[PDB]
Structure 1
C-alpha cells in the first residue's frame, strides 16, 4: 500500500545529566598508623540490623545513616 516518507528532523539529546563518579571511597573511612592500628573516622551505626558495618554521612552539623535513615544532631 501507500508508504510514508519518514521525515527525519535532527534533535540533539546527547547531553544528559548523570551523577558524578566517586573513585576509591573506601580510603577515607579508615586511617591506619604506621604500626598497623586502625582508626575509624566515621561513626558506627547502633541500629537493629545494620550495625558494625554501616558508616555515617558526616553533615556540617550532624550524622546520617544510609540504610535506615537515622538522624542525629
Structure 2
C-alpha cells in the first residue's frame, strides 16, 4: 500500500555512473545510496 506521496517541485555517493541527480535522504550516517 505504498502511496508514493506526490513529491512536489524541489548529495552524492560511490558508483559515479550516477548522473549527479541521486541526492540522498539525510536521516543519519547515510552512507548507503538509494541505488542499491
> TM class by shorter-chain length?
0.3 to 0.5
Higher relative contact order (CA 8 A, sep 6+): 2
* TM-score with structure 1 setting the length: 0.34
Q: Which has the higher strand share?
A: 1
- With structure 2 as the length reference, what TM-score do the two structures score? 0.46
